[PDB]
Amino acid sequence: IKVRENEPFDVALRRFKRSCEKAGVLAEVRRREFYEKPTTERKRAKASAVKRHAKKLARENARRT
């Protein structure tokens, strides 16, 4: 979150923010009390995630490719 890089940088060179949190949590706790949906989205988060995992597992066939 604190970047300096001495003298020879000439540019931002800053990814650490977005590489840490930045808005990830800010645009998340920005508003919306939720308290309930979190569970729903938590569940659905990896729910659909397992599909990208599962479907990809047996997706090898032909499609001529």
Question: Which partner in another protein, RNA, none is near 49 (CB below 5 to 8 A by kind)?
Answer: RNA
Which residues from 11-30 bind another protein, rule CB under 8 A? 16, 20-21
Q: What residues have CB less than 8 Å from 29, skipping those under 6 apart?
A: none
State which residue, 3 or 27, has the beta carbon closest to RNA: 27
Q: What is the DSSP string of 32-60?
A: ---SSHHHHHHHHHHHHHHHHHHHHHT--
Q: How far is the CB of 55 from RNA (least distance, A)?
A: 10
Token pair for 52: 């990208």
Is residue 3 involved in binding RNA (CB under 7 A)? Answer: no
